[PDB]
């Protein structure tokens, strides 16, 4: 069986240098053309570089030339990539594919940003609302955190169904996440709904009680 696992990804400051690695298994690297591809936040696939087998040429994308270098470590059955004048444009999930992108390894996120920060929670309550379905939707805006991940729960478990946690969005070197729940207009405001947000890295725990508007 073939196997490719990439590593090396980490946060990095704009201008910073980074070195990624693709370790292979199930084959001999030497007579195997390897490609480095990237999937951007926008969920677009972009070609980065290709190194031919034998001992041939290495082709670079124009978006990468001069700044990124490729290498093999046939001896350790490894493939490296030197990331060097990291620009914003570069935050992405770096994968390595074998010949004609048959086999692909799991990826490694590199994020070009500013610095670590605990999240600011905002309770999102309906503007002097109604109840179409005798159902009301409340949310929580988990804003400006660094780095990922985050843990968002409602009445710590209790509200499970109705809940819709959405993926983060990065904008000025900080993430923006959102979550919600929809309860019958019987439970809120009669009973309370709290959103339990934790930015585990920062060891931040925050509770917000959603109160009318």
């Amino acid at each position: 069986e073939v196997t490719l696992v990439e590593s090396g990804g980490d946060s990095v400051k704009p201008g910073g240098s980074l070195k990624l690695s693709c370790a292979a298994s199930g084959f001999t690297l030497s007579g195997e053309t390897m490609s480095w591809v990237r999937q951007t936040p926008e969920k677009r696939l972009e070609w980065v570089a290709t190194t031919l087998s034998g001992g041939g040429f290495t082709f670079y994308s124009a978006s990468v030339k001069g700044r990124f270098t490729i290498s093999r470590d046939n001896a350790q059955n490894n493939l490296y990539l030197q990331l060097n004048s990291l620009r914003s444009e570069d935050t992405a999930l770096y994968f390595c594919a074998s010949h004609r992108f048959v086999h692909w390894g799991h990826g490694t996120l590199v994020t070009v940003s500013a610095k670590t920060t605990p999240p600011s929670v905002y309770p999102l309550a309906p503007g002097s609302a109604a109840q179409t379905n005798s159902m009301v939707t409340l949310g929580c805006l988990v804003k400006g955190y660094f780095p990922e991940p985050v843990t968002v729960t409602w009445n710590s478990g209790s509200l499970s169904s109705g809940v819709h946690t959405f993926p983060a969005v990065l904008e000025s070197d900080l993430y923006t996440l959102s979550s919600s729940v929809t309860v019958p207009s019987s439970p809120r405001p009669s009973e309370t709904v709290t959103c339990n947000v934790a930015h585990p890295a920062s060891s931040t725990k925050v509770d917000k009680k959603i109160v009318p508007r």
Binding site: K43, W47, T50, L93, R100, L124, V169, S178
Partner: protein
């Protein structure tokens, strides 16, 4: 060069669907070694076709590659439910690889369905920090494609609006969310705010009148 792909297509289990790939430089040929891969949820990637016809080991017979017209094409004969995925194409222009934008393929695994839109006004706590994040959430829509457009007093708000990427709910339906960000000052200058969610020819609008 630029490689072009249809945004999205949809079929029913059992049908035959064709996805195409096109080169802006001229007719795609064998010299471009047309390559086709599939992205499954959680960014899982598997190459299906390579060399403009050859089906990679493992991959089932239902996928075929060829050139028809001045383009590369991937035919999925009797398209199964588990084929709902994203299909990318790559063409080799004797020096590099140009990847296309993918096609989100839907295999109608349950009735067409409409989005549940809800617009949230900015929090007070937040207005104090001089920021105004309006949140628009889109839910339980099927197929997983939507266009969000923002309007402030009629005028489409051309910037500082970020939308997410549809994701799968346990009911294999999808969700998304858009944001608008103004300073607390920009917010004050306007009395009307609209979030518009278009889905299969049908615009859904949710609003709030600030003043």
């Amino acid at each position: 060069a630029v490689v072009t792909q249809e945004s999205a297509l949809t079929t029913s289990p059992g049908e035959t669907v064709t996805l195409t790939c096109r080169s802006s430089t001229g007719a795609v040929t064998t010299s471009n070694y047309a390559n086709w891969v599939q992205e499954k949820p959680d960014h899982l990637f598997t190459g299906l076709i390579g060399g403009t016809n050859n089906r990679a080991p493992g991959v089932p017979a239902r996928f075929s590659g060829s050139l028809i017209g001045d383009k590369a094409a991937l035919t999925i004969t009797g398209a199964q439910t588990e084929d709902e995925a994203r299909y990318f194409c790559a063409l080799w222009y004797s020096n590099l690889w140009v990847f296309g934008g993918g096609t989100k393929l839907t295999v109608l695994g349950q009735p067409k369905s409409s989005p549940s839109v809800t617009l949230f006004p900015p929090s007070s706590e937040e207005l104090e920090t001089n920021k105004a994040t309006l949140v628009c959430t889109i839910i339980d829509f099927y197929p997983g494609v939507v266009t969000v457009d923002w309007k402030v007093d009629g005028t489409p708000v051309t910037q500082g609006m970020e939308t997410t990427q549809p994701s799968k709910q346990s009911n294999n339906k999808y969700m998304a969310s858009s944001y608008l960000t103004l300073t607390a000052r920009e917010w004050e200058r306007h009395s009307s705010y609209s979030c518009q969610v278009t889905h299969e020819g049908h615009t859904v609008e949710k609003s709030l009148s600030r003043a």
